[PDB]
Design a binder for this molecule. Structure first.
Ligand code: HEM
Ligand code: HEM
Ligand SMILES: Cc1cc(N)nc(C[C@H]2CNC[C@H]2OCCNCCc2cccc(F)c2)c1
Ligand SMILES: Cc1cc(N)nc(C[C@H]2CNC[C@H]2OCCNCCc2cccc(F)c2)c1
Ligand SMILES: C[C@H](O)[C@H](O)[C@H]1CNc2nc(N)[nH]c(=O)c2N1
Ligand SMILES: C[C@H](O)[C@H](O)[C@H]1CNc2nc(N)[nH]c(=O)c2N1
Ligand SMILES: [Zn+2]
Lengths: 403, 403
């Protein structure tokens, strides 16, 4: 029933008993494992998801089974009874957002989960107020390049009406202009979101790193367009510690990773619009975004840069150059005084987190295939550690694109 | 769409469904509540399994439902009727062996599934005789560098009577000698089996790369020790194409990967000895056996020779060294004319295998975590490929070491 979990480097063994508190089916069954798929295709329920969540918070501040807890438990019981829903108190919502991050199986940064700036933006009622809220979050989070973890919660879903949404998947991301000649200027992964932007009447540039404007949508209104003012957006040019030419490449990435399309779920309530951010691990920029073939796919150009042998796989030019890009990403961010983290440091601190969690709750749910870096997998200690995935709440879910 | 796992390739945008998994007749480790993907070690019934196997066979020869098919069935029932067990026709053994390897979710090797040499050794009655079978195997399969897939099949398990069993995990393994100051000389993987060889009479070496003897067991007889004639065991001295100093590290590997401790299960018949072999993927040696902290752990040594900053993670001295070491594996094998294959080509071709299997059977069981290499993960196409993993029979399966 409870799983043995070995580390294959140190022959050490633990037991998840946290996953006993999973109230949510994932994709696997005893017949097949679906664990590598990325995506997954009533008052009595709400009232019970609430109760529980209230129970986490009182237990969190040690004030379990007492007056303020009991009393707050009729408050929700009565609010649902009458109106089919309730609302959170600020501190409660500060406890859930943090915890939603604690429970994110696919996060390698979860050691930081205690340290989260929570902006409560639930008193928002137009896209114009959204833009401002978002604009502050960025100024705060960026901090002249000493990045800081932040989330900003906008108002919850309501049964009678459309959601507050941000159309973008991140707050910063680059244009991807599809061209006549089948090709693409800039980031291929943001083609559809660039087009959507043009359809709502944005003036588009034509470089490789045109920062996208923001499409914010308030309940039942058509979405609106807000260009982010260039100075809130911190960018970092790409140069190499020894390779003079690397620079002359025009490569650069932005400083702030802020996910802006995921849904945040606390106590059975749902926040369709709740962007969050911390800081990048080098391998998000160096390996995935520049290195993927369906993205910027600069590898071959790096390799030709270096005058290696393009003609054959077994010379390892794929791997040699990748390596320099992650080295270029780390160097370049360190020079700009922007917070970055390499995948060795990162995963090492992730192991500490599992150990921290093992003692604190009895396990930690994690998704092996997402935690292990996209290069040098076995060279990181997370490769050698078995993990469990299950679903805890508070939680970030995926949600449909609003068009 | 259909109620069958939908399976996507994120690089290409392509979609398939896996109908094969419906034929899985045996549960893995997951449930809807939790995913165990990462865990390394996750009469009436006899007739039931055999019937399915025979169907499977007659299908593969297009004679499904025919006279010869219903005849073999009745014959197989009658076999089991009076004896408890049954026996496989020669060609039934050749097909189930191939089917067992085609069904192996952890093997990236599968495109070659149809090209296997099957050595029937079901006539073998002594440990002395295994040594002989085994020596022929290595001779055949090594074929002086031009390597060849093969499997030798020893007598099946049987009521009462005890098993045949190669005790070595591989036909070729380097010794692992426990020092009197905690550390190990040689492959730490093999301390347990090394100790057993000595206890059973073997005079041991004092090296990093000593080939182990063979501990062979025959029903109810004590295991017996057999030394491989050095001339039979082909090894490769490791050199680097541009770093002249690398050769001097005294590094070497052997040419033949040959698993010897797995169970081969067909039609509910179990073969407890069935060494099988193929040819290496470069990362099995370059990255795993050489760079694992718990194996030879040569990463630091190599990085010093490379003059890398090994006091900070962010230099990517690990990544840089592992590449070189892998490149030197690839190059050492090339030069000696010994069949090898680099993670890049080897995965390009698992992609092809996937497409073939889609057409032939509607799907292919795959352990993502294992199919994806320990280095340059995202840089290979399997990284972007969702996989479905279930258990199909005939299978290779783990068994408990015999002692
Ligand atoms: C502070 C440093 C942080 C680092 C280094 C970090 C790193 C990462 C990485 C590397 C991933 C998966 C990478 C990928 O998309 O391929 C990820 C996923 C995730 N992160 Fe973190 N993160 C950080 C902070 C945060 C914060 C503040 C939150 C929210 C409060 C967060 C929530 C999540 C969630 C929900 C996922 C899953 C995304 C998905 O399922 O698609 N992370 N993080
Ligand atoms: C033809 C060249 C071959 C290549 C490149 C290849 C590659 C591999 C690799 C890379 C693995 C994963 C091993 C690990 O890292 O632990 C593997 C596992 C496996 N291979 Fe293949 N292989 C080849 C031939 C064969 C043959 C001939 C067989 C059987 C006849 C076979 C059967 C298996 C099985 C059963 C496993 C699973 C072991 C486990 O589950 O732990 N392979 N193979
Ligand atoms: C908060 C934070 C910090 C950090 N270092 N890293 C992150 C992950 C961000 C950045 N780097 C990738 C992005 O991850 C975004 C979430 N992943 C989406 C994967 C996906 C793709 C396409 C279709 C889908 F349905 C799903 C978040
Ligand atoms: C036939 C063939 C060809 C090839 N290239 N590669 C192979 C896998 C071999 C070689 N390279 C590793 C070994 O695979 C053996 C599979 N077992 C390892 C998992 C394991 C389970 C339990 C305890 C452990 F310590 C380890 C076979
Ligand atoms: C299909 C596979 O699940 C998919 O390619 C995953 C693999 N691992 C990943 N790991 C991280 N950190 N981020 C990713 O996008 C992916 N993609
Ligand atoms: C924890 C994890 O399951 C384990 O380290 C696996 C990961 N993937 C692997 N993949 C291969 N090919 N071989 C392995 O030994 C492993 N080890
Ligand atoms: Zn699973």
């Amino acid at each position: 029933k409870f799983p043995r979990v070995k580390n294959w480097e140190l022959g050490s063994i633990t037991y998840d008993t946290l996953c006993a508190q999973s109230q949510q089916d994932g994709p696997c069954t005893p017949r097949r494992c679906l664990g590598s798929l990325v995506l997954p295709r009533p008052a009595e329920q709400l009232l019970s998801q609430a109760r529980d969540f209230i129970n986490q918070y009182y237990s969190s501040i040690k004030r379990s089974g007492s007056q303020a807890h009991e009393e707050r438990l009729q408050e929700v019981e009565a609010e649902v009874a009458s109106t089919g829903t309730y609302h959170l108190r600020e501190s409660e919502l500060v406890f859930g957002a943090k915890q939603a991050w604690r429970n994110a199986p696919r996060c390698v940064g979860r050691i930081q989960w205690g340290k989260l700036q929570v902006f409560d933006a639930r008193d928002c009622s137009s896209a114009q107020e959204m833009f401002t809220y978002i604009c502050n979050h960025i100024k705060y989070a960026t901090n002249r390049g000493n990045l800081r973890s932040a989330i900003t919660v906008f108002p919850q879903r309501a049964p009678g009406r459309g959601d507050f949404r941000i159309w973008n998947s991140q707050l910063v991301r680059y244009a991807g202009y599809r061209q006549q000649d089948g090709s693409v200027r800039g980031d291929p992964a943001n083609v559809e979101i660039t087009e959507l932007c043009i359809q709502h009447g944005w003036t588009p540039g034509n470089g490789r790193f045109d920062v996208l404007p923001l499409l914010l949508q308030a309940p039942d209104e058509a979405p609106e367009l807000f260009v982010l003012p260039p100075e809130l957006v911190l960018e970092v040019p790409l140069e190499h510690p020894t390779l003079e030419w690397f620079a002359a490449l025009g490569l650069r990435w932005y400083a702030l990773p802020a996910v802006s399309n995921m849904l945040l779920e606390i106590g059975g309530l749902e926040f369709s619009a709740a962007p969050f951010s911390g800081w990048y691990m080098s391998t998000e920029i160096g390996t995935r975004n520049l290195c993927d073939p369906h993205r910027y796919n600069i590898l071959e150009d790096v390799a030709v840069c270096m005058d290696l042998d393009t003609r054959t796989t077994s010379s390892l030019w794929k791997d040699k150059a990748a390596v320099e890009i992650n080295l270029a990403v780390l160097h370049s961010f360190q020079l700009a005084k922007v917070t970055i983290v390499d995948h060795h440091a990162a995963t090492v601190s992730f192991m500490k987190h599992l150990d921290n969690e093992q003692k604190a709750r009895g396990g930690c749910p994690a998704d092996w295939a997402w935690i292990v870096p996209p290069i040098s997998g076995s060279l990181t200690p997370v490769f050698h550690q078995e993990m469990v995935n299950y679903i805890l709440s508070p939680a970030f879910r995926y949600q449909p694109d609003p068009w």
